[PDB]
Amino acid sequence: MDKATLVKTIAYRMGNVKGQDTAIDFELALSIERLEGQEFVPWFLLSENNFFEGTAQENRIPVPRGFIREYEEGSLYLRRVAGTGKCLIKKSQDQLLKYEGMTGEPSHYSLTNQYFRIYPVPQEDFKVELLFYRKSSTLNVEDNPWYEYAAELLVAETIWAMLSARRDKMADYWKSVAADQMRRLTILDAERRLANQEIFMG
Amino acid sequence: MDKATLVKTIAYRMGNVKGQDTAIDFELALSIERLEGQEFVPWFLLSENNFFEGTAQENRIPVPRGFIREYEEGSLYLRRVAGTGKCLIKKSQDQLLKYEGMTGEPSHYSLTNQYFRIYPVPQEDFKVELLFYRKSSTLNVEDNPWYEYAAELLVAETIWAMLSARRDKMADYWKSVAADQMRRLTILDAERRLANQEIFMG
Amino acid sequence: MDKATLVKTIAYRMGNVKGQDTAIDFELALSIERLEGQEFVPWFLLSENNFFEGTAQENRIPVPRGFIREYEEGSLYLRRVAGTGKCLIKKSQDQLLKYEGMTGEPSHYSLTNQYFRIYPVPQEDFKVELLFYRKSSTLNVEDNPWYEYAAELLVAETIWAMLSARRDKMADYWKSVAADQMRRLTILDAERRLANQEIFMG
């Protein structure tokens, strides 16, 4: 889908409307963000590994631009001068108060709100790399993946919006349509992660 | 968002409004306040670290401004001049009355009604560290966080309020929309608080 | 079928159409795409064997084009120049970080987001074997498989879409027809996957 077949589809399914093309656009954009704010997250939004450079004597670390959440299976990693590193561990701030006023490599990471924190204070310059889900806009990818993936969800949900502003009954028919698609999407996501892994009880 | 797109969205959704933008502004602000008063606290309301100094022989410490509720896996911290620190414990006033007259380092406190009381009463001035949840009207960051994240709740609630004022049926529908959105955000909060923690007994 | 009988069937079933064949074509294609995006993968979407070669010191391998999900009782295979081969194992990124710096034969991988990563990193160019599910728009066989098998789903869904666009009641009826057909095909998939297998514990 090419961001143009979407508006054509919206006109066609809405009833062959003609002169709302600006409106259509405003709305489709309003929509992708809303869905992004949603609590569920699809699978195409994990960023390429991004790293941050940290200056010494500072514990708090700014959150990446437009961050949403960390990766369930990926963690902050520090890369030393030799090229190797270690995986840092996270804990609630309270449990991490003990290492206050201590010396060494970093060891623990905590969320706070906008700032990560390193309580084992790195006395020198340091860097870590992360794997995090990020807002669609921020990602470099030449084009919006939402356009490619589940374009139907997108079509449906925007149609609902204008229709809600049009106080017409079928707003719901579309809403419901979005839902089926949304559920299915979660199934695809869950179906894909475990596709070829073998588990053992140890 | 930029506080303009939100207004034009409100105008478009509820029936292509032209001139109620003044009522839009008045009633919209009201929304942010109402939601803040409600029992729920989203993550992006979390304030940054705070500190305070209290004089000698004054066991009463007033509540910090704009305070709502402390951070759960956070606690009151006592910072000494030597750089060493400690975390004071919390108990009900009753349990803590006993110490009435024990001099030395502060150890405990109670919420009481509007003032902090430390029964181990120092004889000199002393500094404290504190963390809590604060209203957006009282945080020191430039932009209001609420617009950025959860715009929809804000779009819906003002509309629900705006539409309910004119005695129009769709009020129940919009209120249901807002309720669904609130449940979504409540799920998303736990999505982040326990995002990638690892736990083991002891 | 031959893509003509399908169109004339669509025209006849929905009320003896004459001229909407252009909309028929546009909206029909859309159907095949929508269905592909959905959580289900019918057997005749399965791609043929694929191979790829990656250069030295480059542990990142991009996703094959048109990929959706790998084949479950299939797995990534490493082919060596001597004709000998092996099958690499799958684990989450976290489990597999340890090997960071172990040289030799590749052994493991992770799905990650869009790129394959092998932590046992060879120092030379190397060839890989792969199998997966691909979209019909990206398979190398001359004809689109979907028309041949499961035409009915395709007949119904485009009609359901075509009829729902004009705001006509029978939309629910046609959607139910499509749902029944999808359940049928889902049953038929398992009819073939486990057609005549014989099993015994170990």
């Binding site: 960023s47 390429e48 590994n49 991004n50 790293f51 941050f52 450079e53 200056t55 500072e58 708090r60 700014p62 990446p64 631009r65 700032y115 470099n140 | 940054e48 670290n49 705070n50 500190f51 305070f52 100094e53 007033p62 910090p64 401004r65 504190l130 020191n140 | 990142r60 991009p62 790129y115």
Partner: peptide, 19 residues
């Protein structure tokens, strides 16, 4: 009433790896 708010002046910037 002297709750002061410490300021965050440390530079905030990230980077991305080329494919």
């Amino acid at each position: 009433y002297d709750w002061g708010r410490p300021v965050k002046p440390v530079g905030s910037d990230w980077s991305t790896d080329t494919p």
